[PDB]
Write a protein that binds this ligand. Structure first.
Ligand SMILES: Cc1cc2nc3c(=O)[nH]c(=O)nc-3n(C[C@H](O)[C@H](O)[C@H](O)COP(=O)(O)OP(=O)(O)OC[C@H]3O[C@@H](n4cnc5c(N)ncnc54)[C@H](O)[C@@H]3O)c2cc1C
Length: 537
């Protein structure tokens, strides 16, 4: 009629703290309608290399957006979901109703520049206003890069030093008022021609089915903005009591791998939860009060033990902005070139399928397949095991496996964590036994083997004395407990003692040749490594 404005969802699947959505609603007074649009283009929202679990999470998030639009407009507003190329869909959508502007939340990762540029050039041709808003991150990552002298900060301490100069991140924007917004009804033949979804599809519609084994799902995850704001309320409620109490309880600070999907990592990846609303609700809770207690070596004053977790996310996102080779070693200026072993498919497949013979490694990789989420310490041990603390394979193989099955699986965050853990050759402590030994770690995180028997069911009838080291059982014990090593449960795919030694020498031989390291993504110091891996020291 009078025209319409497009709020194009890729990430930022939420209605709160959406600067692009407010800009799309900025013309309600002129009769300009609103068109919520999501496009399955085969890459957006991490849909090029995706498994069933994350695809289910994304569809849960899209259904939440559509339901909120209906709830606030008495069923007048809908989320239009297409399938195809955006420039093809948007030009013909412009032919039906005159588009005045297309608003998006900035996808700062370089893997999105090609897609966003095709729409940018399409907006110049059709005289469509192209509105881009920085919102998926705490700061504009360029602002951090220009402050650091044109290069992104390569250490977590240098990133903190930069954002201290910049100041606190912006506050979340107001909530969108959709009750008075106008929406369009498209011609059914146009919805016919451009493959607009009548109902929200299932992952099977994109030929995505059960994982590499299937049904070990003990816990499940609900995507969407509504579930994200519920998990945040429960988190702040736990922090409110700890803030009033003045300290964490001893078990609240313990790594709990037997817990539940209370994590909000996937919700922050897809933008179901605003990172700024997260940051400032934690800030307002701890505001103007001096505490003394620490959480895993990090102070509690000002909620720094939580807001700092949102800094790690910002610190890996910023590093990749102007680096299109961020997910590989060859050609990456911020990654240490390490002589990894050439790809060994048998070792890689045994690591993906959780068939390494090491119980904690196998249980973590099978949980990744079943549920798509691992605790930060479980991601630590399986990353070290694949790389410097075991198989000596390239971190690129694990990055590609994580990006398919993780519920979060940010392109920059996952790649940065893989380089941070695997390619920091000058971090002496990283190669210690407190990190590379999954047996000693399994006895700390899972003393009774309950987590191991949950995801490695062949070790169910194995007693606690042998559940962490089943190869220690005698022949009579292996046959009594119905678990023969090499039949029911495979043998260790590698001799860990000789492998860790071999790999430690390769790191020492690597440092002595460079003598002085080139600037690369690395821990800031040894205290940061203790905090990163949850070391009891
Ligand atoms: C090999 C490896 C791969 C990883 N891949 C991802 C990934 O794809 N996506 C992802 O969000 N996180 C990733 N991380 C970081 C970490 O595994 C998760 O952020 C964390 O397990 C999420 O659980 P949580 O929300 O309870 O953590 P919390 O302690 O509650 O963290 C709060 C928030 O801060 C962010 N955050 C916390 N730690 C880190 C970190 N080290 N780096 C970046 N962000 C952080 C999380 O997104 C989370 O929502 C990876 C870590 C490793 C070692």
């Amino acid at each position: 009629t009078r025209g319409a404005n497009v709020i194009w969802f890729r990430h930022g699947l939420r209605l709160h703290d959406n600067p692009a959505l407010l800009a799309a609603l900025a013309d309600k007074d002129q009769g300009i309608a609103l068109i919520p649009v999501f496009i399955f283009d085969g890459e957006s929202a991490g849909t090029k290399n995706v498994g069933y679990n994350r695809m289910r999470f994304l569809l849960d998030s899209l259904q939440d957006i559509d339901d909120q639009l209906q709830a606030a407009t008495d069923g007048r507003g809908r989320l239009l979901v297409f399938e195809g190329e955006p420039a093809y869909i948007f030009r013909r959508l412009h032919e039906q109703v005159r588009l005045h502007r297309i608003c998006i939340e900035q996808d700062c990762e370089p893997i999105w520049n090609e897609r966003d540029e095709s729409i940018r050039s399409l907006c110049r041709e059709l005289n469509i206003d192209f509105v881009e808003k920085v919102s998926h991150t705490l700061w504009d990552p360029q602002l951090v890069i220009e402050t650091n002298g044109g290069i992104p900060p390569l250490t977590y301490q240098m990133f903190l030093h930069t954002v201290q100069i910049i100041g606190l991140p912006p506050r979340p924007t107001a909530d969108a008022r959709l009750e008075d917004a106008t929406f369009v009804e498209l011609d059914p033949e146009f919805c016919r021609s451009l493959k607009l979804f009548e109902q929200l599809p299932t992952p099977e519609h994109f030929n995505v089915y059960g994982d590499n084994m299937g049904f070990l799902a003990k816990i499940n995850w609900r995507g969407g903005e509504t579930q994200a704001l519920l998990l945040l309320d429960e988190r702040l409620k736990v922090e409110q009591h700890a803030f009033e109490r003045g300290f964490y309880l001893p078990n609240q600070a313990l790594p709990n791998i037997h817990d539940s999907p209370k994590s909000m990592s996937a919700h922050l990846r897809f933008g179901c939860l605003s990172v700024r609303r997260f940051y400032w609700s934690v800030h307002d809770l701890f505001k103007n009060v001096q505490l003394r207690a620490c959480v895993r070596g990090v102070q509690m004053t000002g909620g720094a033990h939580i807001t700092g977790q949102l800094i790690w996310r910002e610190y890996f996102y910023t590093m990749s902005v102007n680096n299109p080779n961020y997910d590989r070693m060859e050609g990456n200026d911020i990654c240490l070139s390490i002589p990894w072993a050439k790809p060994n498919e048998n070792l890689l497949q045994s690591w993906r399928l959780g068939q390494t013979g090491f119980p904690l490694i196998d249980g973590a990789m099978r949980q990744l397949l079943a549920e798509g989420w691992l605790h930060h310490t479980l991601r630590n041990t399986v990353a070290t095991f694949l790389t410097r603390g075991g198989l000596w394979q390239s971190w690129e193989h694990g990055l590609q496996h994580f990006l398919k099955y993780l519920l979060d699986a940010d392109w920059s965050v996952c790649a940065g964590n893989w380089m941070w853990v695997s390619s920091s050759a000058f971090e002496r402590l990283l190669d210690s036994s407190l990190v590379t030994c999954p047996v000693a770690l399994a006895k700390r995180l899972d003393p009774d083997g309950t987590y191991i028997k949950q995801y490695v069911p062949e070790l169910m009838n194995v007693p606690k004395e042998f559940v962490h080291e089943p190869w220690r059982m005698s022949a009579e014990q292996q046959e009594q407990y119905e678990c023969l090593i090499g039949v029911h449960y495979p043998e260790r795919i590698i001799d860990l003692s000789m492998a860790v030694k071999r790999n430690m020498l390769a790191m020492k031989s690597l440092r002595n040749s460079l003598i002085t390291p080139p600037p690369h993504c690395r821990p800031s110091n040894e205290e940061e490594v203790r905090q990163f891996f949850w070391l009891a020291d």
